[PDB]
């Protein structure tokens, strides 16, 4: 294929578009880029390990990868205390070396390997219009994805377990012996409203549900992989979809935008797959923690926190949710759907329980609430912690803030890319992506509007 504008029709700034029909070069680009991803995983892990002070919390040190490893149950014990630093190092080293291998392969295919693969092999050669081959590649990758989900399941069940922040006796790494395979729970998660108090799938709150849903995901992905290997797209799919490389790219871009938004919300709200031990409190958690901290302090001072009415007439410390549940008062009324391992022991069937509040509060809960209140996910861009009017002496931005902001931004720009490529794929399939033909300008053959 050509490597300039005259021979390709694409400028340098759209040079990767020149690869659309060079399957070998495209494969090289993909493999090298995968090498970039794995390289970042390894290098960032080693950086985080090197810059890790293991007696300080992870979320106080700007770490986003080490929490992922800790959640999987590696190198941590009860309450998230880092037992062994070596497994983090091993994850990083393995990713770095494998990235070397992937980069070598991507360079080979991009620079010297065969330009196209179709006259080399039918198995690896593909045509974008070859619907059966495209569904074959879908099938292979679906099988792989289901296998990866089952790898998560195997780690949680047979290889030491995963970190369970809801464990009795304290959050700890525990082995999940009874995943919920019950499809009612698993698929009723997908039907929950994406609004406050329901939290469509962000509300999954126990590792049994997570592991069981991953068993279901693995089975679904593998069976769909086989289904796509053994069939071709049906008539309705053929009549509804654009069948081109750019169209498939646009479809994947839409999917990725959806996943990016979901991940940003997930890290912002969920404290089960993102234990606060490693990611710090959620904003909801920190607000509730402040309310709890001052309930505890004022109660020790002698305030009768059940009957103390605030300035507006609502309870200063306790109040009712619009459905009647007893909740913390103040602005944190909006966060009454929050559930956390440190707060549920004080919750009764009706909400917060006066008897537990008056005699069941443990010193570790007070310490945890103070920590979470002071590590609220508020911070400046230059990493000054606290409310924006605070002064420069607290260097902290929550990992939840970093992850949520970054992935909302990436989700948005991938929605933009999906719009761009979907529109372009449609126009190119219909053949007017290069502009209006003067001879057959469609609007010239149309009746005037009025």
């Amino acid at each position: 294929g050509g490597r300039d504008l005259p021979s390709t029709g694409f400028a340098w700034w759209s040079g990767n578009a020149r690869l659309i029909n060079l399957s070998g070069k495209l494969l090289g680009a993909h493999v090298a880029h995968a090498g970039l991803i794995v390289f970042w995983a390894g290098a960032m892990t080693l950086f985080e390990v090197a810059h890790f002070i293991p007696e300080k919390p992870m979320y106080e040190q700007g770490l986003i990868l080490l929490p992922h490893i800790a959640t999987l149950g590696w190198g941590v014990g009860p309450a998230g205390e880092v037992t062994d630093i070596f497994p983090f190092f091993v994850v990083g080293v393995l990713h770095l070396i494998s990235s070397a291998v992937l980069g070598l392969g991507g360079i080979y295919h991009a620079l010297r390997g065969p330009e196209v693969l179709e006259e080399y092999s039918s198995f690896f050669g593909y045509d974008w219009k070859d619907k059966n081959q495209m569904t074959n590649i879908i099938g292979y990758h679906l099988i792989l994805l289901g296998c990866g989900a089952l790898l998560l399941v195997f780690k949680a069940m047979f290889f030491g377990g995963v970190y369970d922040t809801w464990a009795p006796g304290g959050g700890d790494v525990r082995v999940i012996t009874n995943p919920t395979l019950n499809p009612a729970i698993i698929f009723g998660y997908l039907l929950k409203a994406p609004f406050g108090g329901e939290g469509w799938i962000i509300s999954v709150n126990n590792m049994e549900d997570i592991i069981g849903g991953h068993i279901w995901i693995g089975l679904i992905c593998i069976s769909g992989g086989i289904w796509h290997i053994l069939t071709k797209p049906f008539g309705w799919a053929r009549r509804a979809l654009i069948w081109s490389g750019e169209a498939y790219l646009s479809y994947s871009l839409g999917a990725l935008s959806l996943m990016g938004f979901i991940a940003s919300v997930f890290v912002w709200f969920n404290n089960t797959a993102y234990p606060s031990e490693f990611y710090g409190p959620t904003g909801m958690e920190a607000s509730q923690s402040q309310a709890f901290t001052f309930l505890v302090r004022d109660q020790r001072l002698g305030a009768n926190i059940a009957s103390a009415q605030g300035p507006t007439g609502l309870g200063k410390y306790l109040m009712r949710s619009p459905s009647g549940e007893i909740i913390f008062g103040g602005e944190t009324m909006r966060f009454w759907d929050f559930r956390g391992p440190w707060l549920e022991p004080l919750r009764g069937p009706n909400g917060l329980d006066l008897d537990k509040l008056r005699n069941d509060i443990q010193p570790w809960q007070v310490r945890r609430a103070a920590e979470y209140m002071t590590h609220a996910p508020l911070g400046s861009l230059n990493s000054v912690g606290g409310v924006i009017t605070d002064v420069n002496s607290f260097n902290y931005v929550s990992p939840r803030a970093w992850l949520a902001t970054s992935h909302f931004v990436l989700g948005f720009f991938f929605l933009v890319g999906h719009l761009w490529h979907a529109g372009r794929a449609r126009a190119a399939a219909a053949g007017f992506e290069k502009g209006i033909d003067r001879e057959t300008e469609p609007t010239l053959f149309m009746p005037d509007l009025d």
Binding site: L5, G9, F10, A11, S14, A17, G310, P311, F432, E433, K434, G435, I436, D437, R438, E441, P442, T443, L444, M446, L449
Partner: protein, 176 residues
């Protein structure tokens, strides 16, 4: 420094409430809108004048013919938005007119503020709130915000005045 000037004008002059500033905002946002929409409309109604996917080199500065279809653009915007430009000359004069008039109107408002001739208050709502302690609007809330800004900002912003506002005279809500 400019940010300080901006917040100063909000707190002391209630500059957002000023109709001349609102016409300025309308002009600037409309100018940005016109820029974006015109650029996109032209780029997406281009004539097929070359063979490259790169449409940028299918234009020649000395060419006599339009490079994009005004008719198609007009039909598109008539059906999408209800109305559309049909005169190119009026379109470009409008692109000049909108932001320039916005700037001129905002300048008139600033001239007013030079003499403290502000659009600070709505007297009817002030009187009602003074006699009715349950009347609350976003306007009155903004008035409260301005009071807070002035009291907390003046001692540092105007050091030559030697403003000494003891902690107890500072307005503030509960718990904050």
């Amino acid at each position: 420094g400019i940010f300080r000037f901006i917040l100063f004008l909000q707190g002391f002059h209630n500059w957002t409430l000023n109709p001349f500033h609102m016409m300025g905002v309308a002009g600037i946002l409309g100018g940005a809108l016109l820029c974006a929409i015109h650029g996109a409309t032209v780029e997406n109604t281009l004539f097929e004048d070359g063979e490259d996917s790169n449409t940028f080199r299918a234009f020649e500065p000395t060419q006599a013919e339009e490079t994009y279809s005004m008719v198609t653009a007009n039909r598109f915007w008539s059906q999408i938005f209800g109305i559309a430009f049909s005169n190119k000359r009026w379109l470009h004069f409008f692109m000049l007119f909108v932001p320039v008039t916005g700037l001129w109107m905002s300048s008139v408002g600033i001239v007013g503020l030079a003499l403290n001739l502000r659009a600070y208050d709505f007297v009817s709502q002030e009187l009602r709130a003074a006699e009715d302690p349950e009347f609350e609007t976003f306007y009155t809330k903004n008035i409260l915000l301005n009071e807070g800004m002035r009291a907390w900002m003046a001692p540092q912003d105007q050091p030559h005045e030697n403003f000494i506002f003891p902690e107890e005279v500072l307005p503030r809500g509960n718990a904050l």
